[PDB]
Design a protein around this nucleic acid. Structure first.
Ligand SMILES: [Mg+2]
Ligand SMILES: [Mg+2]
Ligand SMILES: [Mg+2]
Ligand SMILES: [Mg+2]
Ligand SMILES: [Mg+2]
Ligand SMILES: [Mg+2]
Ligand SMILES: [Mg+2]
Ligand SMILES: [Mg+2]
Ligand SMILES: [Zn+2]
Lengths: 83, 102, 24, 137, 135, 214
RNA sequence: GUGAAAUUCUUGGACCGGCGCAAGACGGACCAGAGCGAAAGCAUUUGCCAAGAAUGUUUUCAUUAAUCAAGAACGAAAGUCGGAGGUUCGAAGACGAUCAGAUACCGUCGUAGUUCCGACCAUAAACGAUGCCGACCGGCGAUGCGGCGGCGUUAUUCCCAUGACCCGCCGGGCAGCUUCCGGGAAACCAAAGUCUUUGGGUUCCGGGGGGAGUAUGGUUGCAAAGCUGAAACUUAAAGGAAUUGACGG
């Protein structure tokens, strides 16, 4: 392939490439909002949280820090923020 | 001239590999350099299986095997004819020789 | 001569030379 | 009297045969079932007088034949096998006399039980003799 | 033991087969009697050696298609090849077993919704690829 | 000059009640002379005897020791001394492209017998696996080793030696070990390769009689 | 025990079989063109002590960096010093064989040593015979670690997580197969390429073969020795890679 359009890559190969090796850098992480059952507060947590996030209104754990991505405690709902 | 790319051994990302003694002449040889043969021989000769089966106190008795791992230095390996010299192109192949089942 | 044995011979000779020099 | 055990006909008595089939010589030792008490032991070296054939298959054949004759005369009619090589830090393959010895024990009419390799395998041994350059021949 | 025919006799035999296949029979002595007039042979020994190889070759011809050309076998070969079109097309299947993914490809090629097509149930397991190494 | 075998008498050897084939075999000893009593001559003998000639239709690679400690009449009374596997089976079980998890633990029974149990564990490649090797990571191996070291204790501590003997006859310990570790890393070929008697409790006679009798 | 023997141990029970006791080495098979470490090197279980890469990261400082005379740490084996221990193996040494001779290869015995602690030495074909950092330049299938995404299978449980396989993707590694990328004297090398179309940064280092890694001086060392290191003289070749032939116990 001697004529690859390096300057309009389709989002597929753009997304599968490494974050720094993208044409313009884009973090793979994001922010999500998490819903503990029985709580009204909408807690915004990092998708790669390294710490134990907690509800200020109830003593329960929300995400378990893991290698790359925080693992959300079961029974919790989450949706993407602004894609 | 460099005869073999791997220098006649399998040591790649290591500095030192512990040695073993050749089973034939008791020469120290690096473990990956040595030729290893895993011989699985019947404990009895095929010509004596019938005699042992007839002289057995059991009816369906399976013959035990003989599980032995052999290490040769390449001197003994070439001398005992387990390995052979090959052409320059044939040295580039690593496929084990065929079993010859029929 | 194998280079190792030439080296060993030369080391012997150097020891002897140092000995004779020390005797003076 | 026959110097034997009081046994029936449809059943049989079992001894233990230790074949130390090294090179340079072979052993056709036969003991009792516990192994402490021995019945008869003949070697290939006591059946040839040439010192070359002490590990030859024929010497083991003669020794196994005489062990069989002695055991039958005493009243032992079945044997287990515990084959052994030199072992230790030395070689693990049995000598040439193992095969002929076992074939002779079978052919002589003696019955055979469990066959087992009991060669002394080290979890790790001392330094094997010969030096790091081996046995130059 | 020491009965290998050379190129000379073999080539002469093949040439007279491909020239005089019609005028030859399975007999040795009949085939040795034609080589005097269909050729010039300096020796009687070489003549009957060629005759024997001709008998062998044409026995093989009657048994199979030897690489020495046989005109009749050429026409049966020809009529096999450039003929026998079956009455029904081997590519006119009333139903064709089709991938859902290739069905999606066909509708992206505007050829979805065709009656002769049946959507195969895609397999499950993804167990292709041979096991690596021995065992 | 005369043979010593005219001076030898024959004795029977009896397995415990744990084994249905009680009749192990016959062993001989020299008759009694002087102070050299034959009773002590029988005592302290091991009878390295298999399992299939002790039980009925079980595996042939299991192997038992059966020390002799008392003789009465023309019979020897034997008690469990240790079990192990055959050379052939053990060395066939080891294969390349898979890891061996071995564990040992020293444990005392309820009645004072002290035992050293050794266990082997082999990693099983899945039936649909394409990867040539089936290796477990070091922490996985450590977890399996700790799991089996934990589980062999409670099969020995809380209970007596005779039922230990008849429960390692089917190697239910090894089957349980295989079943416990599937959630960590699948195993396939798990046996208690060896046990060796370390200490014994003073040889109570009544225990021996009820082990042979009822 | 050997090719064959012999030295050697043996009716005072040697070899062999059994049960124990003790000692010191060594951690088989699993063990891989696999992992880790700056290299040397590192493989029985468990615990403890600190340490590290890669990965992950919309964390932080903001050029703090790369390479490096002098200098410094570590540095296989062997060797040296002091103290324990000395099973096996085994320089030196002794003997038996072999031989024309055999100060050897072979067999038997055996000191130092080989093992642990402490202290030296600073050398190896210490090799990838191949400096480090950075960028670019073909493909393919694997493999180790980490992360991400998915048909399905399996393990408990009632399901998801979590493991074990399957299929891909990314980052860092150990490598492999293929290629008229290109390079080279070629062997070969995806680096030994992007070098007469010669310049990314930087350290060391060679100038025909011997003499010679010698002499002398300096310096380190308990020593053995290590670092630095000539000249006279001699020589027309010495070498590297491939081709053909001859020869091969
Ligand atoms: Mg060469
Ligand atoms: Mg090295
Ligand atoms: Mg030779
Ligand atoms: Mg050292
Ligand atoms: Mg000392
Ligand atoms: Mg010795
Ligand atoms: Mg630079
Ligand atoms: Mg010069
Ligand atoms: Zn060798």
């Amino acid at each position: 392939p001697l004529a690859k359009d390096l300057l309009h890559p389709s989002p597929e190969e753009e997304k599968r490439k490494h974050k720094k090796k993208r044409l313009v850098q884009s973090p793979n992480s994001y922010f999500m909002d998490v819903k503990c059952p029985g709580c009204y507060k909408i807690t915004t947590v990092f998708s790669h949280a390294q710490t134990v996030v907690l509800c200020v209104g109830c003593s329960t754990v929300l995400c378990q820090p893991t290698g790359g991505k925080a693992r959300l405690t079961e029974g919790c709902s989450f949706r993407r923020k602004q894609h | 001239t460099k005869k073999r790319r791997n220098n006649g051994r399998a040591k790649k990302g290591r500095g030192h590999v512990q040695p073993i003694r050749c089973t034939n002449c008791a020469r120290c040889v690096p473990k990956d350099k040595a030729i290893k043969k895993f011989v699985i021989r019947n404990i009895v000769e095929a010509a004596a299986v019938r005699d042992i089966s007839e002289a057995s106190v059991f009816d369906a008795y399976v013959l035990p095997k003989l599980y032995v791992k052999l290490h040769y230095c390449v001197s003994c390996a070439i001398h005992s004819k387990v390995v052979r010299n090959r052409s320059r192109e044939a040295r580039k192949d690593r496929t084990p020789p065929p079993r010859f089942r029929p | 001569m194998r280079a190792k044995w030439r080296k060993k011979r030369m080391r012997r000779l150097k020891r002897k030379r140092r000995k004779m020099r020390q005797r003076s | 009297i026959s110097l034997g055990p009081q046994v029936a006909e449809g059943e049989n008595v079992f001894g233990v045969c230790h074949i130390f089939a090294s090179f340079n010589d072979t052993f056709v030792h036969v003991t009792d079932l516990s192994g402490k008490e021995t019945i008869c032991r003949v070697t290939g070296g006591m059946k040839v007088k040439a010192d070359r054939d002490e590990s030859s298959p024929y010497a083991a054949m003669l020794a196994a034949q005489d062990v069989a004759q002695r055991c039958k005369e005493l009243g032992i009619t079945a044997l287990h096998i515990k084959l052994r090589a030199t072992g230790g830090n030395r070689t693990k393959t049995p000598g040439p006399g193992a095969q002929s010895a076992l074939r002779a024990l079978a052919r002589s009419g003696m019955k055979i039980g469990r066959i087992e390799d009991v060669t002394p395998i080290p979890s790790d041994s001392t330094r094997r003799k010969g030096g790091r350059r081996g046995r130059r021949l | 033991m020491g009965r290998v025919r050379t190129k000379t006799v073999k080539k002469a035999a093949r040439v007279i087969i491909e020239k005089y296949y019609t005028r030859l029979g399975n007999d040795f002595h009949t085939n040795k009697r034609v080589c005097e007039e269909i050729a010039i042979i300096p020796s009687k020994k070489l003549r009957n050696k060629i005759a024997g190889y001709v008998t062998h070759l044409m026995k093989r011809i009657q048994r199979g298609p030897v690489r020495g050309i046989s005109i009749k076998l050429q026409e049966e070969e020809r009529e096999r090849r450039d003929n026998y079109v079956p009455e029904v097309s081997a590519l006119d299947q009333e139903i064709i077993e089709v991938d859902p993914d290739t069905k999606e490809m066909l509708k992206l090629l505007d050829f979805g919704s065709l009656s002769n097509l049946q959507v195969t149930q895609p397999t499950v397991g993804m167990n292709f690829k041979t096991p690596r190494g021995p065992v | 000059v005369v043979d010593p075998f005219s001076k030898k008498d024959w004795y029977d050897v009896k397995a415990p009640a744990m084994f249905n084939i009680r009749n192990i075999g016959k062993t001989l000893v020299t008759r009694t002379q002087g102070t050299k009593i034959a009773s002590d001559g029988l005592k302290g003998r091991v009878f390295e005897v298999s399992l299939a000639d002790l039980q009925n239709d079980e595996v042939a690679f299991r192997k038992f020791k059966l020390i002799t400690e008392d003789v009465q009449g023309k019979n020897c009374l034997t008690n469990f001394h240790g079990m192990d596997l055959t050379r052939d089976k053990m060395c066939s079980m080891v294969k390349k492209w898979q890891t061996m998890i071995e564990a040992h633990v020293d444990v005392k029974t309820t009645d004072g017998y002290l035992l050293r149990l050794f266990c082997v564990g082999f990693t099983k490649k899945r039936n649909n696996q394409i990867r040539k090797t089936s290796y477990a990571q070091h922490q996985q191996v450590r977890q399996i080793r700790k799991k089996m070291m934990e589980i062999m204790t409670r099969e020995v501590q809380t209970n007596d030696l005779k039922e230990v003997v008849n429960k390692l006859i089917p190697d239910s310990i090894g089957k349980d070990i295989e079943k416990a570790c599937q959630s960590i890393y699948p195993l396939h070929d798990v046996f208690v390769r060896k046990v060796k008697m370390l200490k014994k409790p003073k040889f109570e006679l009544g225990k021996l009689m009820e082990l042979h009798g009822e």
